[PDB]
């Protein structure tokens, strides 16, 4: 609700996050583009030259091997359904290892959900 003498509107960092059109006096809402940071999941260059790419904190509608995780959208790695130990950590329980799946129809980077450990159940009894 801009008062008649209020043209702009600032945040704590003194950057305008609301403006009013000088022709039609409507209240706009300035917001910078959907920026972010890119991480590159990669096995050793000795082992392979294929890299998965993680767009951190980005819903990747911004643009098959597309995986959306709480850490961001991971592009280049297939989401396997089982769980292994953690080799490269991505975040929010999602890891990613370079596993030769079958040595034929293979050479891919996978992205599973980290496994905590071998499930167990002690045979407790009162005697």
């Amino acid at each position: 609700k801009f008062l008649p003498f209020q043209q702009f509107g600032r945040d704590i960092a003194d950057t305008t996050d609301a403006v009013r059109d000088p022709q039609t006096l409507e209240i706009l809402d300035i917001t910078p583009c959907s920026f972010g940071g890119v991480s590159v999941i990669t096995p050793g260059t000795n082992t392979s030259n294929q890299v998965a790419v993680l767009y951190q904190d980005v819903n990747c509608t911004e643009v098959s091997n597309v995986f959306q995780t709480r850490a961001g959208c991971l592009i280049g790695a297939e989401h396997v359904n089982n769980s292994y130990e953690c080799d490269i950590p991505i975040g929010a329980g999602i890891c990613a290892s370079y596993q030769t799946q079958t040595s034929v129809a293979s050479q891919s980077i996978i992205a599973y959900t980290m496994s905590l450990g071998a499930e167990n159940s002690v045979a407790y009894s009162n005697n």
Binding site: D11, I12, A13, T15, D17, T31, P32, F35, G36, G37, Q56, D57, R70, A71, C86, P89, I90, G91, A92, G93, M114, L116
Partner: peptide
Amino acid sequence: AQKFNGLTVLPPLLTDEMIAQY
């Protein structure tokens, strides 16, 4: 308003449903 100045906050590797299982 922190975020729009490059002040990203990364998520922990162990989500709380994993810590609460440890």
